[PDB]
Swiss-Prot record:
SMART domains: Dynein_light (SM01375). Belongs to the dynein light chain family. PROSITE patterns: DYNEIN_LIGHT_1 (PS01239). Acts as one of several non-catalytic accessory components of the cytoplasmic dynein 1 complex that are thought to be involved in linking dynein to cargos and to adapter proteins that regulate dynein function. Cytoplasmic dynein 1 acts as a motor for the intracellular retrograde motility of vesicles and organelles along microtubules. May play a role in changing or maintaining the spatial distribution of cytoskeletal structures. It comes from the Eukaryota. Homodimer. The cytoplasmic dynein 1 complex consists of two catalytic heavy chains (HCs) and a number of non-catalytic subunits which present intermediate chains (ICs), light intermediate chains (LICs) and light chains (LCs); the composition seems to vary in respect to the IC, LIC and LC composition. The heavy chain homodimer serves as a scaffold for the probable homodimeric assembly of the respective non-catalytic subunits. Dynein ICs and LICs bind directly to the HC dimer and the LCs assemble on the IC dimer. Interacts with DYNC1I1. Interacts with BMF. This is Dynein light chain 2, cytoplasmic. It comes from Mus musculus. Its main location: cytoplasm. Gene3D superfamilies: Protein Inhibitor Of Neuronal Nitric Oxide Synthase. Keywords: Cytoplasm, Cytoskeleton, Dynein, Microtubule, Motor protein, Transport. The keyword Cell cycle does not apply. GO terms for molecular function: identical protein binding; protein-containing complex binding; scaffold protein binding.
């Protein structure tokens, strides 16, 4: 019995981001309980403190495997029971 997954999938970043992401993700979920604010709070917190711009997006097993490339060259991917977050920099 575990109705609260919340796990990370993969991350090809330096590491300071998957760390600041897991935190900005934890605080984003603690400060914000929405889906567009978590992505707007992590995307706004990332670009406003990591240089524009990051693609902190959220979803639910929709189609994060045929429209997240954009030549990322580095990114991270979180999971939250039915939800899927994708942070990265398409700069």
């Amino acid at each position: 019995m575990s109705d609260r997954k919340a796990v990370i999938k993969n991350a090809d970043m330096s590491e300071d981001m998957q760390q600041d992401a897991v935190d900005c993700a934890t605080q984003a979920m603690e400060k914000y309980n929405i889906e567009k604010d978590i992505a707007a709070y992590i995307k706004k917190e990332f670009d406003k403190k990591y240089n524009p711009t990051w693609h902190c997006i959220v979803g639910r097993s929709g189609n994060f495997g045929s429209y997240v490339t954009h030549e990322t060259k580095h990114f991270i991917y979180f999971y939250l029971g039915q939800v899927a977050i994708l942070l990265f920099k398409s700069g």
